[PDB]
A paper describes a structure:
The first structure of the catalytic domain of RpfC (Rv1884), one of the resuscitation-promoting factors (RPFs) from Mycobacterium tuberculosis, is reported. Resuscitation-promoting factors (RPFs) have attracted much interest since their discovery in the late 1990s. The mycobacterial RPF proteins share a common 70-amino-acid RPF domain and the presence of N-terminal signal sequences suggesting that the proteins are translocated to an extracellular location.
The structure was solved using molecular replacement once the space group had been correctly identified as twinned P21 rather than the apparent C2221 by searching for anomalous scattering sites in P1. The asymmetric unit consists of eight copies of the RpfC chain. Chains A, E and S have the most residues modelled into electron density (Gly1–Lys86) with an extra helix beyond the end of the conserved domain (Gly78). Despite soaking and co-crystallizing with a range of substrates and substrate fragments, for example N-acetyl­glucosamine (NAG), polymers of up to five repeats of N-acetylglucosamine and NAG-N-acetylmuramic acid, and peptido­glycan fragments that are generated by a number of enzymes, we never obtained clear density for substrates in the active site. In RpfC two residues display an elongated conformation (42GVGN45), very similar to RpfE (137GSGS140), to connect α-helices 2 and 3, while a 310-helix (321GLRYAPR327) is present in RpfB. Based on the structure that we have solved, we propose that the five RPFs from M. tuberculosis have similar substrates, although variation in charge around the active site may give rise to small variations in the specificity for different peptidoglycan modifications.
Author numbering: 1 to 86
Write the structure that this text describes.
């Protein structure tokens, strides 16, 4: 079973701050935009959601969009980009 390293992706995206909310239009450890978070079943502010809830919503984004949803940081997942970009 694959296990994307979302902690690694979060380090890339936010410096590992699962509660990131700096005013750049992105939220939480994985820097979700609100329209993507809502679209994949997230509610409220991603920065208020647990790491585990954030990861749950990322796993859904991955299945539908691939690691293209994190175009620079996706490689840090440890999944081969050539196979998981879509």
């Amino acid at each position: 079973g694959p296990s994307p390293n979302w902690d690694a992706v979060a380090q890339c995206e936010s410096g590992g701050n699962w509660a990131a909310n700096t005013g750049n239009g992105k939220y939480g450890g994985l820097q979700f935009k609100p329209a993507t978070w809502a679209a994949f079943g997230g509610v409220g502010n991603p920065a208020a959601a647990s790491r585990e809830q954030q990861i749950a919503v990322a796993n859904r984004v991955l299945a539908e969009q691939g690691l293209d949803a994190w175009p620079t940081c996706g490689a840090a997942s440890g999944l081969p980009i050539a196979l998981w970009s879509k």
